[PDB]
Design an enzyme around this catalytic site. Structure first.
Site, PDB file in Angstrom:
ATOM      1  N   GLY A 226       0.378  -1.102   0.444  1.00 53.90           N
ATOM      2  CA  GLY A 226       0.250   0.610   0.135  1.00 53.90           C
ATOM      3  C   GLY A 226       0.503   1.393   0.090  1.00 53.90           C
ATOM      4  O   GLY A 226       0.382   2.572  -0.880  1.00 53.90           O
ATOM      5  N   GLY A 227       1.878   1.761   1.418  1.00 56.21           N
ATOM      6  CA  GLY A 227       2.271   2.395   1.456  1.00 56.21           C
ATOM      7  C   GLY A 227       3.583   2.617  -0.119  1.00 56.21           C
ATOM      8  O   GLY A 227       4.076   3.483  -0.401  1.00 56.21           O
ATOM      9  N   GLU A 247      10.632  -3.228  -2.247  1.00 55.63           N
ATOM     10  CA  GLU A 247      10.250  -5.124  -1.594  1.00 55.63           C
ATOM     11  C   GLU A 247       8.527  -4.709  -1.574  1.00 55.63           C
ATOM     12  O   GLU A 247       8.631  -4.170  -0.077  1.00 55.63           O
ATOM     13  CB  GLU A 247      11.317  -5.446  -1.089  1.00 55.63           C
ATOM     14  CG  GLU A 247      12.445  -5.975  -1.525  1.00 55.63           C
ATOM     15  CD  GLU A 247      13.135  -4.525  -2.649  1.00 55.63           C
ATOM     16  OE1 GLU A 247      13.925  -4.084  -1.548  1.00 55.63           O
ATOM     17  OE2 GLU A 247      13.819  -4.723  -3.930  1.00 55.63           O
ATOM     18  N   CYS A 283       9.736 -11.867   5.106  1.00 52.02           N
ATOM     19  CA  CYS A 283       9.324 -11.351   3.588  1.00 52.02           C
ATOM     20  C   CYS A 283       9.743 -12.153   2.661  1.00 52.02           C
ATOM     21  O   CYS A 283       8.592 -12.184   2.190  1.00 52.02           O
ATOM     22  CB  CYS A 283      10.024 -10.635   3.331  1.00 52.02           C
ATOM     23  SG  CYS A 283      12.115 -10.307   3.134  1.00 52.02           S
TER      24      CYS A 283
HETATM   25  N1  LIG Z   1       8.383  -7.857   0.670  1.00 52.49           N
HETATM   26  C1  LIG Z   1      10.220  -7.257   1.072  1.00 52.49           C
HETATM   27  O1  LIG Z   1      10.956  -7.845   1.307  1.00 52.49           O
HETATM   28  C2  LIG Z   1       9.289  -6.700   3.166  1.00 52.49           C
HETATM   29  C3  LIG Z   1      10.672  -6.716   3.961  1.00 52.49           C
HETATM   30  C4  LIG Z   1      10.133  -6.320   4.876  1.00 52.49           C
HETATM   31  C5  LIG Z   1       9.730  -4.694   5.231  1.00 52.49           C
HETATM   32  N2  LIG Z   1       8.201  -5.494   3.744  1.00 52.49           N
HETATM   33  C6  LIG Z   1       6.552  -5.472   4.513  1.00 52.49           C
HETATM   34  O2  LIG Z   1       6.276  -4.421   5.844  1.00 52.49           O
HETATM   35  C7  LIG Z   1       5.519  -4.587   6.147  1.00 52.49           C
HETATM   36  C8  LIG Z   1       5.801  -4.479   8.128  1.00 52.49           C
HETATM   37  O3  LIG Z   1       4.988  -2.859   7.630  1.00 52.49           O
HETATM   38  P1  LIG Z   1       6.435  -1.322   8.020  1.00 52.49           P
HETATM   39  O4  LIG Z   1       5.886  -0.941   8.845  1.00 52.49           O
HETATM   40  O5  LIG Z   1       6.806  -1.972   8.165  1.00 52.49           O
HETATM   41  O6  LIG Z   1       5.910  -0.904   6.444  1.00 52.49           O
HETATM   42  P2  LIG Z   1       4.923   0.213   5.593  1.00 52.49           P
HETATM   43  O7  LIG Z   1       3.885   0.965   6.519  1.00 52.49           O
HETATM   44  O8  LIG Z   1       5.187   0.115   4.177  1.00 52.49           O
HETATM   45  O9  LIG Z   1       6.475   1.362   6.231  1.00 52.49           O
HETATM   46  C9  LIG Z   1       7.842   1.690   5.640  1.00 52.49           C
HETATM   47  C10 LIG Z   1       8.173   3.080   5.353  1.00 52.49           C
HETATM   48  O10 LIG Z   1       7.649   3.797   4.633  1.00 52.49           O
HETATM   49  C11 LIG Z   1       7.098   4.608   5.112  1.00 52.49           C
HETATM   50  N3  LIG Z   1       5.795   4.788   4.633  1.00 52.49           N
HETATM   51  C12 LIG Z   1       4.913   3.450   4.356  1.00 52.49           C
HETATM   52  N4  LIG Z   1       3.938   4.758   3.536  1.00 52.49           N
HETATM   53  C13 LIG Z   1       4.014   6.104   3.215  1.00 52.49           C
HETATM   54  C14 LIG Z   1       3.725   6.704   2.318  1.00 52.49           C
HETATM   55  N5  LIG Z   1       2.208   6.895   1.111  1.00 52.49           N
HETATM   56  N6  LIG Z   1       4.490   7.927   2.335  1.00 52.49           N
HETATM   57  C15 LIG Z   1       5.604   8.386   3.254  1.00 52.49           C
HETATM   58  N7  LIG Z   1       5.758   7.204   4.043  1.00 52.49           N
HETATM   59  C16 LIG Z   1       5.246   6.213   4.072  1.00 52.49           C
HETATM   60  C17 LIG Z   1       6.840   4.497   6.654  1.00 52.49           C
HETATM   61  O11 LIG Z   1       6.925   5.466   7.100  1.00 52.49           O
HETATM   62  P3  LIG Z   1       6.049   5.459   9.055  1.00 52.49           P
HETATM   63  O12 LIG Z   1       7.619   5.356   9.969  1.00 52.49           O
HETATM   64  O13 LIG Z   1       5.578   6.709   8.875  1.00 52.49           O
HETATM   65  O14 LIG Z   1       4.702   4.414   9.352  1.00 52.49           O
HETATM   66  C18 LIG Z   1       8.384   3.200   7.214  1.00 52.49           C
HETATM   67  O15 LIG Z   1       8.988   4.884   6.816  1.00 52.49           O
HETATM   68  C19 LIG Z   1       5.615  -6.436   6.100  1.00 52.49           C
HETATM   69  O16 LIG Z   1       4.378  -6.073   5.077  1.00 52.49           O
HETATM   70  C20 LIG Z   1       6.470  -6.567   5.404  1.00 52.49           C
HETATM   71  O17 LIG Z   1       6.849  -7.676   5.125  1.00 52.49           O
HETATM   72  C21 LIG Z   1       8.481  -6.192   2.865  1.00 52.49           C
END
Ligand SMILES: NC(=O)c1ccc[n+]([C@@H]2O[C@H](COP(=O)([O-])OP(=O)(O)OC[C@H]3O[C@@H](n4cnc5c(N)ncnc54)[C@H](OP(=O)(O)O)[C@@H]3O)[C@@H](O)[C@H]2O)c1
Ligand SMILES: NC(=O)c1ccc[n+]([C@@H]2O[C@H](COP(=O)([O-])OP(=O)(O)OC[C@H]3O[C@@H](n4cnc5c(N)ncnc54)[C@H](OP(=O)(O)O)[C@@H]3O)[C@@H](O)[C@H]2O)c1
Lengths: 502, 504
Positions: A226-227, A247, A283
């Site tokens: 989403g983000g 990722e 992940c």
């Molecule tokens: N497939 C991969 O390699 C993998 C592995 C690790 C992590 N991830 C995934 O990450 C998820 C865990 O949640 P998360 O907290 O790490 O994810 P997240 O909510 O996407 O946050 C990741 C970073 O992006 C920022 N962010 C998110 N959306 C944004 C937007 N639209 N505008 C500005 N900043 C934005 C967040 O800010 P904030 O600090 O304000 O939240 C944080 O610093 C799981 O689904 C995990 O699988 C992917």
């Protein structure tokens, strides 16, 4: 404005306030980074390599502080964190070797031919150079190896790009200590502080401004679909679109043949260990297992189900992640055609879960292909191998794809691999996808949503290429050519001439 | 199809014989579906086989050279002497990729040596190679109807990588593309390979190109054209449920810096400049669109010589009515601005006049709209106060395909300050020569920072162009019999492979 980190075990604020940065600090940081970009990419390979090693040493020296803080901010065990600091440090050293070798230059030379008719063949030489300042968003589940000084930062600095990290709000204290380490390394190397900058803040406007700043030339992201997709779109809507390497998620499909079940009596045990590793916060966690409708499978399921019931309560990285998991598992567990087994747990702890269903219902519920971050997984019982191969044809992009089989299955596995090659970045045979070796051959990424740029890897020596672009130099005199392309090859790097091997 | 359309005689503006179909989303779906169906088999063919196909296409092209040249000449107005040379370029370009594929270098095989006795955890056997992304959509260039079109660099490199190709034929030269498509059809028959490997779609309704770029089975796009259309298609490609790589060359003005000593050293430098900017009537993406020079007597003489040559240019016939109208409209508008002098050759519409604009770095800074490219036999000279002024200007240049420097040893101290600045905005730097020619070899970088390209980390010309259509896959702990030949322990293909970081 300031904000505090949340104690992962209590949900209460931890000591130490952190600043809430805005577009003002973004502008300042990006401007300073741009100012030092040229000098940074022009440093001798040995110097930038030294910087990376110095960062590694500084990190190791504060390991105590990092582990203590990261443990409270994320609830990850001190032993897991101790291993991650080592991974982080050795990762930096790997890129130090890469930069030092000068391989990343990818020097290519076309031998001139001035007497060619009609027109002569010019002297053309090309190399890779840094794109410029890179913005990095760290992962919440790997607060060290995939964050402030993680793979994206390490490979970008190696490529010669200044780095600006938008600190993850899930572990601000951890990132701060890591930033202090990099600050120390830059001081010892006597290099500009603007080479690396850590921004903090819980207001999303921060990340959006960073991704949209004209001086930012590429982005590294690890997080939610989403983000991640939102930020990706922002990056490509800019007056000057920039590469976005994110990722976003994956279910890591695993195919288990009957003979594999007959060959390893503890296969179910291994499965549960893989899906519950780090409380399933990987992940690469095997999120779906496809198996045949045989007695071995029915026994596999009962063994796994029994282990799941036995599983201890899990504390996820943050209360927020805790909430999404709980609502999604209880929600999916109520869907049509799905059986679920839960372990015993009471909030703020979550229960592990194992879902079971048929391939018929899997086809009917495409939403089950979406990742549910936490200690849960799904088993899909298939009619036969044809059914299994049929299912692989429609799989969405994934970081990995796993196969458990023995020689008896090779005929069918040989048909499955070509399909899995098309949807995953890494194929694992008779093993589990969880572990990610930081070496030269790694491919951590893959087709969307596994990655927003399938033609790359976020882990491994090849990760450095994401932050580089080629430049061709035609008919320049020796004195004006970069060292990597000088006729005498003063750096003694590998170079490809007229198609020959480098 | 419901409708058909005709090609326009570039010399008369009237329709040429032979009607072409107006394809729609229906043909797009059929084409993309068929391409997806053969994608897997195509990428798994032996390197020698796909290499043979490329060479066969090259031979078939040469066999129809007379037809191609005769038709392309009327559809584009490009001299036949130019078209004969472009067919050879096209053919040899295909042969280059045939060599690449045959060498197996594109696999980029990398191996991590396992270590089962490593503590705490053992080091697994990991091997990786590059494989085709899948079907690729290609939009050809109007100014290079052969080398950058139906069987051009994008198509050639994509087929080499193992990707089926679907070309959205340029409406500027449908007859030319048709003949080329017939050649590829013949080659596929001779090689006994599926026709779905290559498909040419035609039509003058833009809905066609948009549907092609948005089709889920299409996995990447190759584009050569305007920034307006190019950026629109790029945006479409990244709004898809599954974003795909879009490699488009949108435009550039190819900045050229000329130092005083260079003009002294070459009395005919102005003559060379005019020849470069009027080559192919200025219809080169690498045409030097702006020249920065110092306010010295050499520069004034340079300007007067260039101006005199421009006044004598033969009327030019451009590629299409739209490019014509766009050129005339844009050169007249710019000439009406204050702070800029323009010199025109003699010409009567539909022919266009060559033009040379002259201005100061001050006025250049006051009219940012002057950096905008104007496709045609037109160029601009910017007289600078001094070298510092010249360097200051280079710092604010937009992305470009090329950047050129004309100097002598005398200037090396300043040129060394300039190169780092130009490295950042151009894909290819040229020293004491002109940017127009593009050598099809191994070291080429045809592209660069936006808008020169939508993906600066690539090239659309040269052996490295093949990598745009490939993605890596890592194989962990697979048995020898299940691994692709490129990664087998014995290296049965005898290709170059990199082990544990060693030099391939
Ligand atoms: N497939 C991969 O390699 C993998 C592995 C690790 C992590 N991830 C995934 O990450 C998820 C865990 O949640 P998360 O907290 O790490 O994810 P997240 O909510 O996407 O946050 C990741 C970073 O992006 C920022 N962010 C998110 N959306 C944004 C937007 N639209 N505008 C500005 N900043 C934005 C967040 O800010 P904030 O600090 O304000 O939240 C944080 O610093 C799981 O689904 C995990 O699988 C992917
Ligand atoms: N940088 C380089 O490598 C390079 C090399 C040569 C050419 N070019 C550039 O090519 C340009 C020549 O102008 P042009 O008229 O040939 O280019 P163009 O207007 O961009 O058209 C190129 C192709 O894209 C199609 N197209 C454009 N807009 C589209 C849209 N929004 N939806 C669907 N299809 C779309 C056109 O379809 P129609 O056929 O229906 O118009 C045509 O087939 C110059 O600016 C030149 O610099 C760049």
């Amino acid at each position: 404005n300031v904000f505090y980190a949340t104690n992962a075990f209590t949900g209460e604020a931890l000591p130490l306030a952190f600043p809430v940065h805005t577009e003002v600090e973004v502008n300042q940081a990006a401007t300073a980074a741009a100012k030092v970009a040229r000098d940074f990419r022009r440093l001798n390979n040995s110097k930038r390599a030294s910087l990376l090693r110095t960062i590694a040493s500084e990190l190791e020296a504060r390991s105590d502080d990092i582990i203590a803080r990261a443990h409270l901010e994320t609830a990850l065990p001190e032993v897991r964190l101790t291993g991650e600091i080592a991974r982080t440090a050795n990762q930096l050293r790997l890129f130090a070797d890469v930069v030092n070798s000068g391989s990343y230059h990818q020097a290519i030379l076309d031998t001139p031919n001035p007497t060619r008719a009609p027109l002569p063949k010019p002297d053309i030489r090309r190399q890779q150079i840094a794109l410029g300042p890179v913005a990095v968003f760290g992962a919440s589940n790997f607060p060290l190896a995939f964050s402030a000084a993680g793979g994206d930062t390490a490979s970008a600095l190696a490529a010669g790009c200044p780095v600006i990290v938008k600190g993850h709000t899930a572990h601000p204290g951890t990132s701060q200590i890591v930033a202090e380490c990099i600050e120390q390394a830059l001081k010892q190397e006597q290099l500009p502080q603007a080479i690396f900058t850590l921004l903090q803040g819980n207001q999303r406007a921060l990340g959006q401004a960073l991704v949209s700043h004209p001086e930012i030339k590429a982005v590294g992201f690890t997080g939610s679909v989403g983000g991640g997709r939102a930020l990706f779109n922002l990056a490509h809507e800019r007056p000057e679109p920039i590469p976005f390497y994110g990722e976003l998620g994956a279910i890591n499909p695993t195919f288990i043949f009957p003979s594999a079940m007959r060959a390893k009596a503890d296969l179910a045990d291994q499965f549960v260990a893989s899906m519950t590793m780090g409380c399933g916060q990987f992940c690469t966690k095997p999120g779906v297992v496809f198996a045949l409708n045989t007695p071995e499978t029915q026994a596999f399921i009962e063994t796994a189900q029994s282990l799941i019931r036995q599983q201890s309560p899990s504390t996820l990285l943050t209360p927020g992640i805790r909430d999404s998991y709980q609502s999604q598992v209880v929600s999916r567990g109520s869907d049509d055609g799905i059986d679920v087994t839960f372990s015993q747990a009471e909030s703020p702890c979550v229960a592990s879960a194992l879902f079971v269903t048929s391939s018929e219902n899997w086809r009917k519920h495409p939403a089950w292909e979406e990742e549910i971050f936490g200690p849960q997984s799904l088993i899909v019982v298939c009619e036969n191998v044809a059914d299994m191969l049929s299912l692989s044809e429609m799989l969405a992009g994934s970081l990995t794809a796993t196969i458990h089989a023995t020689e008896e299955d090779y005929p069918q596995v040989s048909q499955l691999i070509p399909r899995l090659e098309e949807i995953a970045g890494r194929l694992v045979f008779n093993g589990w996808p969880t572990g990610v070796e930081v070496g030269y051959a790694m491919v951590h990424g893959g087709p969307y949503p596994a990655s927003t740029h399938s033609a790359s890897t976020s882990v491994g020596a090849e990760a450095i290429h994401r932050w580089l672009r080629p430049v061709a130099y035609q008919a320049l005199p020796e004195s004006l050519l970069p060292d990597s392309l000088k006729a005498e090859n003063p750096l003694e790097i590998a170079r490809a001439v007229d198609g020959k091997a480098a």
